[PDB]
Design a protein around this nucleic acid. Structure first.
Ligand SMILES: *O[C@H]1[C@@H](O)[C@H](n2ccc(=O)[nH]c2=O)O[C@@H]1COP(=O)(O)O
Ligand SMILES: [Mg+2]
Ligand SMILES: [Mg+2]
Ligand SMILES: [Mg+2]
Ligand SMILES: [Mg+2]
Ligand SMILES: [Mg+2]
Ligand SMILES: [Mg+2]
Ligand SMILES: [Mg+2]
Ligand SMILES: [Mg+2]
Ligand SMILES: [Mg+2]
Ligand SMILES: [Mg+2]
Ligand SMILES: [Mg+2]
Lengths: 1635, 252
RNA sequence: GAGGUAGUAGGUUGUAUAGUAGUACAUACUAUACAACCUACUACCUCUCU
């Protein structure tokens, strides 16, 4: 596409010319005729919808059948137009005058009826699409239409008389009167033929091969062919009039043409095929006479093959073809020898000539090694149907698709085809094209010749003696034939066919004569390259002279380098819409251009050119002006290429670079370790304790702070789990509680709750109204007590762990507090004295005397702890007291059998003689050994209650004493702790851990409240921490009706071409002399084969030496200066438009609001419960975790990045905004932002096991043993120094971190925490609060307005950092209101915007939101190939925003459900609910197909099949051809959301309010059931049986087959356009069939 | 050794008592296989402490107790991936048998597929399912033109019938029409064990002459053609055509 | 109380096949099968407690 620009698709070329003037589209295929018809009805209906005018499609296949025609489906479904196709004898029901139907399909006599009745006016109609008029009968029917309706009306009132006639070359009749019939047809319907179609736009724009109509020789009949024709004509006579008593002629007659045209060798190899096709088809004879006919044919061909084998295999492979064949194959062999990359495309007539030519070139290419490169594959036609014989049809389809896939890429060059290779099949561009047959008509000739477009191009046509009967008679074998058996007019036909060839050249001259646009010949471009390539090239970087320049030729090669490298899908051909222009200056015809780069491109203006003397020098210079303005505007880089994908550099300062911390940076650069931002790499972080809980040990005299640890039981444990049947003691009623002494005032914290043996108990901390003035000796008192509580009672002290009363970490006090008897609480000093009175007192084994002496006290064993001192002396197990048992005794009945009563049991077990026999017993139980009471013991994470104990085992443990724990009182020692203090002491570690976690979350809140003013600084209490708890036949119609316009058309374009309507000899004689003289007619013996000022004056004839100066060349700025001076001195430059009116005007003329924002001024920020939940990883095994919160944080992050990337970077197309977002939102980036902002040291990744996951208060781990691997030595040495003093004093045994002080956390989990905290800030402080927190990490997604400080700012405008060295703040402003994409390059752009957006009020009444900037709506609708939209851009920039808006809207809808979806459920009620299929079906259902503007054929056909198959279905959601989906319509479904988003001052209530009414019955339907998706659904239903093969390419060239297989269940197939569509439909059909 | 090593430590220390201090000292929170490291203590005021490590808490306590007593003295999915590569359904495993003691019941899981069956025995079902699946794993890893020939067949079939008459036809000049072809074709059909069937058509052509099609059992079966002014001339012509057909099939 | 099983249910990590929105292959949220390992409950057992 170098020197000629890129041609448009020919349909919109006819559309443009038909918009320009009246026309007669001479295009063959009916479907694209329907495309262009639909399109002009739509645009001239837009023109018609001003004062009210109709536009007919008068047609001949109407008024007979009650069914609607093929235009009814087209124009009722895929437009907004309403049609009234006239029924057979339409009675016109009621007062229904035709001025309301926009299109009004009739029959021609019906239109005469409407014209004479003055109902349809001939002047008030804006288009008359008469149907096909290349036949006699239709032209005679339309003769009274226009012999009666030209004269009264003027040509001003005459509408466009578009006529969809057939292909002009194979149409009408005869050859001499062809031009006369065309002129009479054009004068008849008041028209002019504009036949510029694919028949024309392959020899005009593309490379023009110079053909060679080569003569072989007269095939002289040697004796071998004489005997062969003798025996074949012997057998002809019987089968001519064969006999039968109570198909063989075609294979005995059309084998002789192989003998006449190819020779005896190809006669043998082509009777091969007939022998197989008849031997296979002789055994199925239901008669017996036809069995004899087929046997005679088969054995004649057997004798034929035997004689041919004995000819050139017994008497003696390039020499065999040279001597024993026709000279036609010698001419073919010489033609292929003339090509020493080749893509040859030999053709044929029938389907057995192709096979014998294949075997000819196969044995030639293999036996003769000279033509080794010829890889031979043949492909015939198809004639069968899947109605009958599917075996042969399938084994032919699976062979044809492999043949055309082999030829498709590069593997085999030649392809000896037949008539299927003309229309349909998409093939690579060719090098040689051979027509072995003389062409049947111009259709075959050009649709075969218009295939070799590379220009080493040769199109050879082999001409030969013609087709006539070569037989002799009905006689038997001759004397010469029997002698051979026993012993062993080019001129006439070539004159006729060069007359046909001059007729073909006259045909192409006629077609090029009827074209609108005219092209300069190759001589003009040759003299352009020779003459005037001496202009100063535009070098962007002129110092280094191997770099970049735009010369004359590089310019025209570059404007079609740039426009084809743009965002575009399959359906769109993006192109530069050139325009030529001539005028006269200084006596010389000067030529302009005008250029228009695509509306997808950001060069939104036309490159108005400069007048050059030829057309092509003007072309090269106008492309040079385009490349100059392109590089100036920024589309071109320093090497004059478009800027790529990754080549976008953001100009904002916070973006780009993204240099890492070196621990992250070297492992990103080298990547030998697992990458950052992933769960695959772990890193260990210090378990950061609260700032209020480090270095806060109270000192003697300074007042400290007393915090009562208050507990209140809320939900007592249900008796279904009360298996032991013990009493339930609420800790509220207990007198002896607990307190914390700490010098720093603890901030307000959320009252969390824990789940212990008494049920759910709520934990708070409160402060006394008076303070504590600590006295002198109490410091060692509480130092002893805390060691006692956390060392001997709860056993929390490890050996790498020792009591350090003057420590840095975990340094607060805990005191035993008592309720006052008169009310209130205070520190129990007497209990402290009791505790300090006894140290590590081993519970002594007492003698018999005192238990003999004193009696049992009932009051001593009320709230007692009763360890047995007769065993386990060093570390006894402590038992509770549930009940006292007066009904039992030491002489009461023993539960067991091996011992007698309790007195006897203790007498013979140990020797403890119980002296008190009247004592009771003690119904006891153990105390808690699993200290973590954070989780409920009887609930799941999903709320499902767990199975409690069976009633049998409950009553067995409660009643039968073989279970249970019963203990004598005088043989147990009461602990100084009561039972109530023991249950509070056991529940202390989880209380302190959750207080610590809430304090870290409050510390994050305070940190972001100090860094950026996001929250209050120092503080009312928080919300509490919790855990949350017939038809199918009709479908066949809609799968064949589209192919209706296929089916008939195929036959309609290969055989008929008939039915004429009612100087040339000189032109044919001139063309014949040119062909015979110019070397085109190959004869059958000839083998195939100035000074600068003068150039300036002839180039710039319209002073010149002033601009030249002393330098060499001239400047383009000087060139526009000469033009400006000449137009200033000489009035006007009135221009004649040489062969566009298509576009003009540039080259011409509160129910859950989603955006709810709290007042961030005076705001407490998020609660530390939600910040804790964001910090809480899912590995915590707690009821709170971050996972459901990261799904809304991530969606808002992606949302806000997308909106900011739209707003800042306003010229760039979104294919690089995706790259900027993928840089910004990626989890590597969110990791390094989190680790920058110290979050990895703030998280929970382990299950809280207080014996192993906790450093108690006033204890200090040395943090030295974990890398190293006496007590006073360990004390003062962990005070001073670690390594040198220590070293002088089941894999990886030198394992990482101790769990007491550090935890391992993977990188993606810190990205998850960042997103989770974005979610927490989102839910609490609004989207703006999440935006400011996103700024606080380092993804700045807001603009900066650095203003001077407010003088100790006080009010503290949030989102404004602490002042720097001077008093200036960096207040983050809101998102900028965007640039409206109304490109004001036309002087009336608001009126042209409303003109091009006519009829969308049905769409806006459908949606409910009336657009205020309707250019957003048009941009959302405008396809990439809607070329007449010189007002806005395409929709891809708005799809890029709309999909992220809808992604966040769906995620925040499913987050708000009371069903409380998981990450998986809320993911998959989105993944199976934001999809191209559901978007396209809601688009089709609400009429988004009816209001989507595009000018693409393939997209229109896909939209046709899908909208019809859906309108059958009521719009519900052999290879199985399921219906292709319009991904463009899903993109329109997203882009309307994006357009409403931007048009609505960036809100999410308007987008969701519009899209709820569409997506809501899918919301409740897919929310109730489980959706899934067909490839995933089949891989889930059958989990690992299902394997998907590699895709294959069909013979059609644009179809893909996938072949899903389920093992031992069936192998299935589906076809489609892409690979995703074909994979989806094949898995969908296997899904439906496997049921 | 049916009892637990933790219970072995408890029994060997129940002679005086002692609550042992079991603490997990160390943990490899690894990328693919987190491991645990318990530490066992024994009394805290006078005069023993050991290490233990493993993948699970139970095996860590086992190793800790074993070390203290001695001082006193992730596959599975990969085989499913390979049977996907060899294109097979997901495997199904069933439970075969247990032991009547519920605290020492060695479960046996029977893994049967469309190819082989193997057993897995263990103290728990997970080790049994591993043993059965692994036995599946190395059991599955131990064992992971012609028509021209028909024409030449018919040629050697007619060459196998090596009567003098066919080479006589091949050698001498056959311009003579005085030979009676009916006995000739009868002898040749008898020579290759074939048969000749005449079908003289009662239907006539447009010249009023008689005609016939004559059938001989070739491979596959065939017929020859003939006509004449009489039916006798028709069968004579078809007879001569069949005789020269047999002559040229033998002519090689 | 320690321990050995079996059931269910919350998970974490790994591997394999992939799905959805992208962009024209990185990006985000993930699923299922399968596994280790953890934790809450239940039923029964050997020992201890009784
Ligand atoms: O031994 C455990 C259990 O049997 C005992 N226990 C006793 C009485 C009662 O009502 N509930 C109860 O759980 O307490 C011991 C430890 O229980 P945890 O699992 O540690 O709460
Ligand atoms: Mg316990
Ligand atoms: Mg993200
Ligand atoms: Mg995430
Ligand atoms: Mg227990
Ligand atoms: Mg389960
Ligand atoms: Mg589970
Ligand atoms: Mg659970
Ligand atoms: Mg996808
Ligand atoms: Mg992800
Ligand atoms: Mg996952
Ligand atoms: Mg899973």
């Amino acid at each position: 596409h170098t020197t000629v620009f890129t041609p448009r698709d020919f349909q919109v070329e006819l559309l443009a010319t038909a918009y320009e003037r009246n026309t007669i589209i001479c295009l063959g295929h009916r479907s694209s005729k329907e495309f262009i018809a639909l399109k002009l009805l739509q645009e001239l209906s837009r023109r018609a919808r001003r004062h009210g005018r109709v536009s007919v499609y008068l047609s001949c296949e109407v008024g007979t059948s009650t069914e609607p025609c093929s235009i009814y489906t087209m124009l009722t479904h895929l437009t907004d137009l309403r049609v009234w196709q006239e029924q057979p004898d339409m009675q016109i029901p009621f007062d229904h005058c035709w001025t309301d139907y926009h299109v009004s399909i009739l029959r021609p006599e019906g239109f005469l009826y409407l014209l004479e009745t003055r109902e349809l006016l001939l002047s008030r109609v804006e288009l008359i699409v008469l149907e096909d008029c290349h036949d006699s009968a239709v032209y005679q029917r339309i003769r009274p239409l226009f012999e009666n309706h030209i004269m009264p009306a003027p040509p001003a009132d005459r509408p466009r008389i578009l006529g969809l006639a057939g292909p002009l070359h194979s149409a009408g009749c005869e050859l001499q009167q062809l031009s006369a019939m065309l002129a009479t047809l054009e004068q008849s319907v008041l028209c002019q033929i504009e036949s510029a179609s694919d028949i024309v736009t392959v020899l005009r724009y593309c490379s023009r091969p110079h053909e060679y109509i080569v003569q072989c020789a007269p095939f002289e009949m040697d004796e071998l062919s004489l005997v062969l024709a003798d025996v074949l004509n012997t057998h002809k006579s019987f089968l001519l009039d064969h006999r039968y008593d109570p198909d063989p002629l075609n294979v005995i007659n059309s084998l002789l043409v192989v003998l006449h045209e190819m020779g005896p060798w190809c006669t043998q190899r082509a009777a091969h095929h007939f022998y197989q096709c008849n031997e296979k088809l002789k055994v199925k004879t239901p008669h017996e006479r036809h069995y004899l006919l087929y046997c005679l044919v088969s054995t004649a061909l057997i004798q034929l093959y035997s004689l041919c084998e004995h000819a050139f295999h017994r008497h003696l492979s390039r020499q065999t073809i040279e001597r024993y064949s026709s000279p036609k194959v010698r001419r073919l062999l010489q033609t292929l020898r003339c090509f020493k990359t080749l893509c040859a495309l030999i053709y044929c007539n029938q389907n057995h000539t192709a096979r014998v030519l294949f075997e000819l070139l196969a044995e030639i290419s293999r036996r003769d090694p000279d033509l080794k490169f010829l890889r031979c594959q043949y492909t015939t036609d198809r004639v069968a149907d899947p109605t009958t014989e599917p075996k042969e049809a399938e084994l032919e389809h699976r062979r044809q698709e492999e043949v055309l896939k082999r030829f498709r890429m590069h593997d085999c060059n030649v392809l000896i085809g037949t008539s299927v290779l003309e229309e349909g099949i998409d093939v690579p561009k060719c090098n040689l094209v051979v027509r072995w047959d003389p062409p049947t008509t111009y259709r075959s000739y050009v649709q075969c010749k218009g295939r070799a477009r590379a220009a080493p191009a040769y199109h050879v046509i082999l001409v030969a003696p013609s087709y006539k009967s070569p037989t002799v008679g009905s006689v038997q074998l001759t004397d010469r034939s029997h002698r051979y058996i026993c012993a062993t007019s080019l001129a006439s036909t070539t004159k006729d066919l060069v007359h046909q060839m001059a007729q073909y050249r006259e045909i192409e001259q006629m077609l090029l004569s009827k074209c609108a646009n005219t092209e300069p010949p190759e001589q003009e471009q040759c003299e352009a390259e020779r003459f005037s390539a001496c202009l100063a090239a535009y070098r962007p970087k002129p110092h280094l002279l191997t770099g970049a320049s735009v010369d004359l030729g590089s310019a025209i090669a570059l404007v079609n380098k740039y426009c084809a490298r743009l965002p575009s899908d399959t359906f769109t051909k993006l192109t530069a819409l050139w325009r030529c222009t001539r005028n006269e200056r200084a006596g010389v015809t000067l030529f302009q251009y005008t250029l228009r780069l695509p509306i997808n491109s950001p060069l939104k203006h036309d490159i108005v050119g400069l007048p050059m003397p030829t057309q092509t020098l003007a072309r090269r210079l106008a492309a040079l002006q385009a490349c100059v303005e392109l590089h100036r505007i920024g589309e071109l880089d320093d090497q004059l290429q478009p800027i790529g994908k990754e080549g976008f550099r953001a100009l904002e300062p916070d973006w780009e670079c993204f240099e890492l911390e070196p621990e992250d940076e070297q492992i990103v650069q080298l990547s030998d370790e697992p990458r950052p931002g992933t769960t695959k790499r772990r890193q260990y972080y210090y378990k950061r304790i609260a700032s209020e809980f480090c270095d806060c040990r109270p000192v003697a005299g300074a007042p400290c702070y007393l915090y009562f640890i208050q507990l209140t039981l809320q939900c007592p444990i249900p008796e279904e789990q009360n298996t032991r049947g013990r009493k339930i003691y609420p800790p509220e009623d207990a007198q002896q509680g607990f307190g914390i002494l700490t010098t720093k005032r603890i901030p307000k914290l959320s009252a969390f709750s824990i789940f212990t043996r008494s049920g759910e108990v709520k934990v708070s901390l409160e402060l006394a109204k008076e303070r504590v003035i600590l006295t002198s000796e109490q410091i060692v008192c509480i130092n002893g007590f805390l060691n006692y509580t956390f060392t001997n009672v709860l056993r929390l002290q490890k050996f790498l762990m020792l009591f350090d009363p003057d420590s840095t970490e975990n340094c607060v006090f805990i005191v035993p507090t008592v309720k006052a008897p008169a009310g209130g609480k205070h520190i129990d000093w007497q209990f402290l004295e009791l505790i300090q009175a006894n140290g590590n007192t081993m519970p002594r084994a007492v003698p018999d005397e005192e238990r003999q002496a004193q009696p049992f006290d009932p009051q001593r064993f009320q709230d007692a702890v009763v360890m047995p001192w007769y065993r386990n002396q060093d570390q006894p197990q402590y038992f509770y007291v549930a009940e006292i048992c007066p009904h039992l005794s030491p002489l009461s009945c023993f539960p067991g059998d091996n011992y007698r009563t309790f007195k006897h049991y203790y007498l013979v077990k140990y020797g403890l003689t119980i002296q008190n026999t009247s004592q009771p017993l003690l119904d006891v139980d153990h105390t808690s050994a699993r200290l973590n009471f954070l989780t409920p013991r009887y609930v799941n994470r999903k709320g499902v209650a767990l199975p409690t104990s069976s009633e049998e085992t409950k009553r067995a443990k409660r009643e039968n004493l073989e279970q249970k724990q019963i203990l004598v009182p005088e043989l147990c020692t009461v602990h100084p702790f009561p039972a109530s203090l023991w249950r509070t002491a056991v529940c202390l570690p989880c209380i302190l851990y959750r207080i610590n976690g809430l304090l870290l979350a409050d510390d994050i809140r305070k940190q972001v409240s100090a860094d950026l003013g996001l929250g209050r600084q120092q503080i009312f209490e928080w919300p509490m921490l919790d855990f949350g708890w017939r038809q199918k036949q009709l479908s066949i119609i809609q799968a064949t009706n589209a192919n209706e316009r296929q089916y008939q058309q195929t036959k309609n374009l290969l055989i008929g071409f008939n039915f004429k309507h009612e100087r040339y000899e000189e032109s044919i004689a001139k063309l014949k002399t040119e062909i015979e003289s110019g070397g085109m007619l190959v004869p059958h013996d000839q083998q195939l084969v100035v000074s600068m000022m003068e150039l300036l004056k002839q180039l710039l004839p319209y002073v010149l030496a002033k601009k030249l100066g002393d330098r060499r060349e001239l400047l383009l700025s000087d060139l526009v200066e000469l033009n400006a001076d000449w137009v200033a001195r000489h009035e006007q430059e009135t221009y004649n438009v040489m062969g566009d009116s298509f576009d003009n005007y540039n080259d011409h003329h509160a129910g859950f609001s989603f955006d709810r924002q709290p007042d961030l001024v005076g705001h407490p920020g998020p609660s530390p419960s939600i910040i804790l939940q964001a910090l809480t990883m899912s590995n915590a095994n707690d009821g709170i975790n971050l996972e459901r919160l990261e799904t809304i944080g991530d969606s808002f992050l992606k949302y806000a990045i997308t909106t900011y990337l739209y707003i800042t970077y306003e010229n760039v197309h979104e294919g690089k905004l995706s790259h900027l977002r993928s840089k910004q939102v990626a989890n590597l980036n969110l990791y390094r932002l989190g680790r920058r902002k110290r979050l990895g040291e703030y998280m929970i990744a382990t299950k809280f096991e207080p014996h192993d996951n906790w450093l108690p208060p006033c204890y200090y781990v040395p943090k030295e043993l974990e890398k190293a691997l006496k007590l006073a030595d360990l004390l003062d040495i962990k005070n001073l120094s670690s390594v040198q003093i220590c070293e002088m004093v089941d894999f990886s045994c030198f394992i990482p971190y101790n769990l007491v002080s550090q935890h391992s956390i993977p990188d993606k989990s810190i990205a998850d925490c960042v997103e989770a905290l974005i979610g927490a800030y989102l839910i609490e402080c609004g989207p703006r609060g999440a935006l400011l927190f996103m700024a606080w990490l380092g993804v700045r997604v807001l603009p900066i307005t650095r203003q001077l400080d407010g003088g100790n700012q006080e009010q503290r405008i949030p989102g404004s950092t602490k002042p720097n060295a001077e008093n200036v703040v960096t207040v983050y402003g809101a998102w900028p209101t965007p640039r409206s994409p109304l490109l004001h390059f036309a002087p009336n752009a608001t009126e042209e915007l409303d003109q091009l957006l006519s009829g969308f009020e049905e769409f806006e009444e459908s949606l409910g939101y009336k657009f205020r900037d309707r250019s957003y709506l048009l941009q959302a609708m405008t396809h990439a190939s809607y070329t007449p939209n010189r007002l806005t851009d395409c929709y891809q920039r708005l799809e890029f925003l709309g999909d992220a808006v809808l992604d966040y809207l769906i995620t925040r809808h499913l987050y708000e459900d009371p069903r409380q979806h998981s990450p998986g459920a809320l993911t998959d009620l989105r993944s199976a609910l934001v999809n191209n299929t559901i978007f396209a079906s809601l688009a089709v259902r609400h009429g988004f197909h009816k209001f989507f503007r595009h000018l693409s054929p393939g997209l229109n056909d896909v939209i046709d099949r899908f909208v019809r198959i859906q309108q059958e279905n009521g719009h519900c959601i052999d290879d199985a051809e399921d219906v292709e989906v319009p991904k463009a319509l899903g993109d329109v479904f997203e882009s309307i959301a994006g357009a409403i988003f931007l048009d609505s001052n960036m809100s999410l209530d308007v987008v969701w309010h519009v899209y709820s009414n569409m997506m809501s019955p899918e919301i409740e339907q897919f929310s109730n059931s489980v959706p899934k998706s067909p490839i995933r659904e089949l891989l889930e239903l059958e989990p690992e049986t299902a394997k998907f093969g590699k895709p294959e390419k069909l013979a059609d060239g644009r179809r893909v087959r996938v072949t899903v297989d389920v093992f031992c269940k069936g192998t299935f197939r589906g076809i489609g356009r892409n690979y995703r569509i074909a994979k989806c439909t094949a898995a969908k059909c296997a899904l439906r069939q496997l049921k | 050794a049916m009892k637990t090593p933790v219970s072995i430590l408890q029994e060997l220390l129940s002679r005086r008592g002692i609550t042992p201090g079991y603490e997990l000292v160390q943990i490899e929170g690894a990328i693919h296989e987190p491991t645990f490291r318990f530490r066992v203590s024994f009394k805290d005021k006078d005069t023993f402490t050991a290490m233990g490590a493993g993948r699970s808490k139970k095996e860590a306590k086992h190793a800790a107790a074993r070390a203290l007593i001695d001082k006193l003295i992730n596959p599975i999915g990969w085989l499913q991936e390979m049977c996907m590569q060899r294109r097979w359904p997901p495997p199904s495993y069933e439970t075969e048998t247990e032991v009547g003691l519920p605290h020492e019941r060695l479960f046996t899981i029977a893994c049967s597929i469309l190819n082989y069956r193997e057993m897995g025995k263990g103290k728990s079902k997970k080790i049994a399912k591993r043993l059965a699946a692994h036995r599946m794993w190395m059991r599955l890893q131990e064992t992971p033109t012609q028509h021209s020939n028909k024409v030449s067949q018919f040629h050697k079939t007619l060459k196998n019938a090596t009567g003098k008459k066919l080479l006589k036809l091949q050698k001498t000049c056959l311009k003579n029409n005085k030979i009676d072809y009916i006995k000739l074709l009868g002898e040749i059909a008898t020579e290759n064990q074939f048969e000749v069937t005449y079908v003289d058509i009662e239907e006539k052509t447009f010249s009023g002459q008689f005609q016939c099609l004559v059938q001989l059992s070739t491979l596959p079966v065939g017929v020859c053609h003939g006509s004449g002014p009489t039916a006798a001339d028709a069968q004579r012509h078809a007879a001569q055509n069949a005789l020269e057909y047999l002559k040229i099939m033998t002519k090689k």
